[PDB]
C-alpha cells in the first residue's frame, strides 16, 4: 500500500454551497494527507519520538494502531467574503492548505 504523502484536493466552493458567502476565490487547492506509516518512520524529520515508539509497540501488540498520515505543515489563504451593506472584506484564513504530510 502507498506510503504517507500529499494528495490533490481542489475545494470548489459551488460544490459545497460556499459561493454565497465567499466572493473570491471560486475554490482553492487544499490537498490532503493519506498513506501507510510503516517502519522506519525516522527516515522523515517531521515524525515524532512518540510515533516511533507507537510503531514499535504496534509490532509487538497489533491492538495498538500504527501512526497516522496527517498534515505536519499548513499554509494560509486570503479570501473575500461579504459583510454588512454587501461590503467585500479581505480576510486571511490560517491552516487552509497542506504543505507537508507526516506520520504522527
Amino acid at each position: 500500500k502507498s506510503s504517507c504523502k500529499r494528495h490533490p484536493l481542489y475545494v470548489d466552493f459551488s460544490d459545497v454551497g460556499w459561493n454565497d458567502w465567499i466572493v473570491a476565490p471560486p475554490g482553492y487547492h487544499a490537498f490532503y494527507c493519506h498513506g501507510e506509516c510503516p517502519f522506519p518512520l525516522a527516515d522523515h524529520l517531521n515524525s515524532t519520538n512518540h510515533a516511533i515508539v507507537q510503531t514499535l509497540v504496534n509490532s509487538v501488540n497489533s491492538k495498538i494502531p500504527k501512526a497516522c498520515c496527517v498534515p505536519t505543515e499548513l499554509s494560509a489563504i486570503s479570501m473575500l467574503y461579504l459583510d454588512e451593506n454587501e461590503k467585500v472584506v479581505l480576510k486571511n484564513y490560517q491552516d487552509m492548505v497542506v504543505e507537508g504530510c507526516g506520520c504522527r
Binding site: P40, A42, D43, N49, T55
Partner: protein, 72 residues
Amino acid sequence: QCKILRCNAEYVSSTLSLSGGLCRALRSYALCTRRTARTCRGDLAFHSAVHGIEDLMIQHNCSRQGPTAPPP
C-alpha cells in the same frame, strides 16, 4: 555522531526498488546499525531501528548472514 538517518534512508531506498530481496536489504540495514552502534548508544531512533529489523527478519524468515555462492 549517530548515523541512523543514513541507515534509514538506504533501507527505504532499497525497498522502493523491491522476500529474498527484502532479507538482503534488512541484512544491509542490520550491518549499517552495527557500524554506527558506538555513536547511537542513547539514540531512540537507533534502538527502534534495531527492534524493527529484528521484527522484520523474524517475519519473512530471513537468514542473518546471507547465502554463499556454491562451488562451480
